[PDB]
Amino acid sequence: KVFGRCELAAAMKRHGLDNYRGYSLGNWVCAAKFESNFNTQATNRNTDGSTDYGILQINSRWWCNDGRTPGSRNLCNIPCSALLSSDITASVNCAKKIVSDGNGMNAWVAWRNRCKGTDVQAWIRGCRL
Ligand SMILES: [Cl-]
Ligand SMILES: [Cl-]
Ligand SMILES: [Cl-]
Ligand SMILES: [Cl-]
Ligand code: NA
Numbered sequence: 001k002v003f004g005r006c007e008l009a010a011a012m013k014r015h016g017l018d019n020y021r022g023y024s025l026g027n028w029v030c031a032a033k034f035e036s037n038f039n040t041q042a043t044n045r046n047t048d049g050s051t052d053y054g055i056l057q058i059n060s061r062w063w064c065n066d067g068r069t070p071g072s073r074n075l076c077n078i079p080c081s082a083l084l085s086s087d088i089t090a091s092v093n094c095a096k097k098i099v100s101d102g103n104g105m106n107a108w109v110a111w112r113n114r115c116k117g118t119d120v121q122a123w124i125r126g127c128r129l
Contacts, residue, residue, distance in 0.1 A: 026120030
């Protein structure tokens with residue numbers, strides 16, 4: 001499913017991502033835009049052999065199991081395919097554990113390079129929340 005900007009913002013707010021660990025809702029919508037283009041079925045291969053999955057491109061090297069990343073961890077205790085669902089519940093709960101691991105939203109390279117230090121509130125402007 002390809003989410004809409006306000007549709008995703010409302011869905012993320014319902015799952016408690018607004019101001020979660022200090023990151024306003026605009027940060028999560030901005031990151032989802034540049035990580036997956038609002039597409040839940042987005043996948044991308046990394047050089048080390050791991051794969052990024054879902055609306056937030058959560059890495060299989062640490063967070064999910066895809067059966068093809070030897071020596072990796074499954075810290076969110078889920079198959080990586082659950083991150084490709086139209087229900088973002090899995091990706092949000094795993095994102096909450098990622099953003100709490102000490103590095104904040106810097107875990108998402110697209111957020112640090114394209115959202116950090118910008119007016120992220122513009123990503124939720126005009127949305128009914
Ligand atoms: Cl915001
Ligand atoms: Cl694996
Ligand atoms: Cl949903
Ligand atoms: Cl932080
Ligand atoms: Na894994």
